[model samples]
Target: LVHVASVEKGRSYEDFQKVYNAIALKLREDDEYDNYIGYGPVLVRLAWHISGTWDKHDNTGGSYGGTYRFKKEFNDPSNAGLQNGFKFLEPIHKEFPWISSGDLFSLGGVTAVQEMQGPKIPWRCGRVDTPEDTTPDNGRLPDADKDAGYVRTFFQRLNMNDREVVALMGAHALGKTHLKNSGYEGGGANNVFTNEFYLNLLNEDWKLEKNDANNEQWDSKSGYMMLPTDYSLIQDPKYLSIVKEYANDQDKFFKDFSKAFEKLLENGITFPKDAPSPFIFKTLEEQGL
Candidate 1:
């Protein structure tokens, strides 16, 4: 169950940084996506969706396989709307053909987060390509319409605890769910990554209603929507406590989020003990860009 990444030969931090910069620069230039929210949110979702398939029980269906490149995985019904993030990275893949599909997909999330002013995510590269048969079947991802117990049980497959699950869901702040894509839509401050998700969950006045897709969702006049899973954070006492903590301390959320995000990306994959230490790339601000 220990999946080792097949590191590209003669590549290191600088090489990956070049790929990161490409993704970041394009994010800045591409203003047409999602009404100028750019590619950040979709990329985050892409990374999560790709890694979310991990089953700690047997180590199948994780980012390590890079199977998302295959039609079976790419065309997954749950993965609708992610094609935008994939197409955005196509040019980068052309430019840096040495990187594996899994690495490119996961790194796009890392690049998007840091560029969006989110917390630093420590990343490592070496996920190798697998045959189409290695791809996991669809429906491995979570159902947005599910409740707190469902959410908790779903993430348990990935070995995440309550704290980690709550922290990871904080990513809901980055993007809106497209009605056409996921039968739900709405979120405030839709572009930047922040603890605003928790804040809104705590402070917003939401009403339950059925969308045009005939799916139930919590809608707010502030132009935000929360999936049943999202509302579960505040409904469950254990999850609600963490939600209050994150909403109260932005810095604490950022720190905990960083750890959880990294863990999510690395799940089901085992890096050799001798593998290089995790890489923490500098932000554009740090590099004085």
Candidate 2:
């Protein structure tokens, strides 16, 4: 099944900007969430999972469907701990009822990244709500307990290459893992967006240790952590070069991540030739709001 992009009725860049502002303001106001880590990280995670379900061969999922709202996808074990992101978005959805689930969820991510001082992330508005049956089955999301080879093969399903995969994984710099959610914990939350994930990958003096949940993860004396998948970046030679480049040059990391993250969100949808170019939203600071 082909999921072509269709803008919502009479909606344009301004309409989505309104939605982005709402999400950004709420992120600021909800200052007490997760020990001050705030909603930014989970919002990004929510958008990634919704889009991550895409299967290039079948086009079964991706940000285009918004199926994450359905119980099956909502309760996905792979999606554990993302409900906070959903709950955070609920009020924004109420405020902007006309926005499609796919657009709102994906935009939540874009908004969170920009609000956290990340990147421009040009975004589009479309993605009509798909039927319940169209919700792709669970387990489409990647597992963290894997190695570099597994990481490479897993992302291939989403059509992400080595560079794209490395760039997207940089999102790990955003939030900490919760033991209850992913059986891993204590990466220490960082709400700001930066190339720190790459820096940590290369610089941390990490030792593999079992967490409280008995899962193996790389632990650093600085109280940070890395998933097996995150550590895989340096384990693989190609991913290591990208990781090094990102760690050494913050600007390059930002640009590459912007393109890769946007591509990840846009994986399964096709826009018409005449569709408007993706809208680049202004951050609240930029607007001096």
Candidate 3:
């Protein structure tokens, strides 16, 4: 069923922008996280994991309800290392107690992307805190041990098409997988957002090898790595075309990522026909930082 209405009672763009500024400032202050990678990637992942729960058919999960705060969803085996992102946002949430959980979670991704020099993702607010029972069960998330067919079908549940899937997966460029977290490790840690995920996919000489988890992952001589699901993009002809597109054109990838991510965060919600336009937050640099 569709969920949410209005942008958190009396809030407006300026109010959300204030929240954005707070998040952005904290991002700058916390520069020592993960050997200087900062919280950007983890925050982006947190936002995605929370929203990626949506099922287009049943409309069960998605960022609209802010259900990730619940233990059941938070402790999902699929959500392994995202607790870092949540703790980072804990203070910000404390300061801005008025914002809804779903809005805060989704907006964290937007702030992370922009602050990391990625893209301007226009965002709207209004995701209420859903009940514990409303949280979608675990296993609704994707698998790293899968192939192209799995990648294609997995995103279909979220109503994402091929291009959207490819664009969204570009986020893999942001952070590495922890062996303790996702049963795989070594994505070579990055905070700045780029189309390098595709570049590494196409340009690197990858070898299929098992990590400590005894699962196959694509590893490169440059110390970068890709999960089997990540490698599937290049293995399949259709996804490869888009990978090449993003590999060569950074601007296009950023734009596509912005749109796809916005859609991902907004899934399962029915906005009023005349809700305010999505707000594009200014980067700290643009803010004269």
Worst 10 residues of 2 by lDDT: 9-18
lDDT of 3 by residue, 61-90 (tens): 999888999999999999998999999988
Full-model lDDT for every candidate:
0.90, 0.93, 0.91
Candidate 3 wrong stretches, greater than 4 Å: none
- TM-score for candidate 3: 0.98
lDDT tens digits by residue: candidate 1, 1-289: 5688767899999988888888888998996798778899999999999999888888998898889999988999999999999999999999999999999999999999999999999999998888899899999999999899999999999999999999999999987788899888666637788899899999989999998899999988887878999999999999999999999999999999999998898888888877888888887668776
Evaluated at residue 187, the lDDT of candidate 3 is 89
Q: Would you estimate the TM-scores of all the predictions?
A: 0.98, 0.99, 0.98
By lDDT, the candidates rank as 2, 3, 1
The digit string of per-residue lDDT tens for model 2 on 214-283 reads 9999999999999999998999899999999999999999999999999999998999998889999999
By summed lDDT, which 10 consecutive residues of candidate 1 come out lowest?
Answer: 183-192
Please give the ranking of all candidate structures by TM-score, highest first, separated by commas. 2, 3, 1
Name model 1 segments beyond 4 Å from true.
none
Candidates in order: C-alpha RMSD to true structure: 1.0, 0.7, 0.9
Give the top-scoring candidate (lDDT): 2
Best by TM-score: 2
